[PDB]
């Protein structure tokens, strides 16, 4: 039903892509971060058409170029707009294994890969990318803004109104619980936790995901 963007901090937005699946509409959340030197994209739209809207939005309202885009794993909902991003000269950057799994599933090829947990800064804004272990996918990573204390958990974290874990096909049900606990131990002062497919909240989203993982 399109693409929606909402502001949560003075320099942080959440972009939301929609797709109707069977019964009901499913959102997909990413982040936009504005810096003094360009915008950072955490996740593409849920495919090409949401991603073209997202780019058009960034150009109209932030009136700055996207310096980089960082998918959080290989699935279409977090990376299916990569081709759209790369066609505008924006570098897409992923973990090494996200690049591997994309190649094995005929997704595009990132422009750069990283094999290490990385902290970097653009335009006064610092970002951390971190691998807590397999959960939703073997390669899912999170992104932390330590200044705004905002943790983006992608499909690794579920929202407080999710009643189960959804699809478990590529899922790593055995590792997911320890990945959550890694997040709880590494970001003890996170203020906002952003899931992919529901509303965001406080650090209750980690304990709720842990709870879903002890009741299956």
End-to-end CA distance of the chain: 32
Nearest to residue 86, comparing CAs of 129, 123, 51, 59? 51
Is the C-alpha dihedral spanning 111, 42, 27, 173 positive or negative?
positive
User: By C-beta, is 176 or 200 nearer to Na ion?
Assistant: 200
Window 90 to 119, contacts with Na ion (CB under 5 A): 95, 97
Nearest distance, CB of residue 103 and its own copies, angstroms:
37
Q: Which does 207 bind (CB under 5 to 8 A by kind): its own copies, Na ion, Zn ion, none?
A: its own copies
To the query of whether residue 22 is one of the catalytic residues in this protein, the response is no
Q: Which does 184 bind (CB under 5 to 8 A by kind): Zn ion, its own copies, Na ion, none?
A: none
Site string for Zn ion, 21-60 (x = CB under 5 A): ----------------xx----------------------
Candidates 215, 192, 214, 186; CA nearest to 205 is 192
Q: Which of 73, 139, 159, 208 is catalytic?
A: 73
Among 18, 26, 59, 64, binds Zn ion (CB under 5 A): 64
- List the single partner that 7 binds among Zn ion, Na ion, its own copies, none, CB under 5 to 8 Å by kind: its own copies
Active-site residue flag, 208 = no
CB 129 within 8 A of CB 141: yes
Residue 158 interacting with Zn ion (CB under 5 A): yes
Distances (CA, A) of 25 to 53, 72, 162: 18, 22, 14
CA distance 191 to 150: 6
Q: Which of 15, 29, 43, 77 is catalytic?
A: 77
Question: Could you say whether residue 132 binds Zn ion (CB under 5 A)?
Answer: no
Site for its own copies in 192-211 (CB under 8 A): 192, 199-202, 204, 207-208
Verify whether residue 77 is a known catalytic residue.
yes
148 binding its own copies? (CB under 8 A): yes
Binding site for Na ion (CB under 5 A): 95, 97, 139, 199-200
- Residues annotated as catalytic are 73, 75, 77, 136, 167
């Amino acid at each position: 039903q399109q693409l929606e963007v909402t502001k949560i901090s003075s320099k942080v937005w959440i972009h939301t892509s929609y797709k109707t699946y069977h019964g009901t509409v499913v959102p997909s959340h990413g982040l936009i971060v504005s810096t003094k030197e360009g915008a950072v994209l955490i996740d593409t739209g849920w495919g090409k058409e949401p991603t073209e809207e997202l780019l058009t939005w960034i150009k109209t309202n932030l009136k700055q170029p996207v310096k980089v885009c960082v998918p959080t794993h290989w699935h279409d909902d977090k990376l299916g707009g990569m081709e759209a991003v790369q066609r505008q000269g924006v570098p897409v950057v992923t973990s090494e294994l996200t690049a591997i799994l994309a190649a094995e599933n005929s997704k595009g090829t990132p422009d750069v890969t990283f094999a290490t947990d990385t902290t970097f800064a653009i335009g006064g804004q610092q970002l951390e990318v971190y691998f807590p272990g397999g959960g939703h996918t073997a390669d899912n990573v999170v992104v932390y803004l330590p200044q705004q204390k905002i943790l983006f958990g992608g499909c690794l974290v579920k929202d407080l109104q999710a009643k189960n874990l959804g699809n478990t096909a590529d899922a790593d049900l055995k590792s997911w619980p320890l990945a959550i606990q890694r997040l709880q131990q590494r970001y003890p002062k996170a203020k906002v936790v952003v899931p992919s497919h529901g509303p965001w909240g406080d650090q209750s989203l980690l304990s709720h995901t842990l709870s879903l993982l002890q009741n299956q």
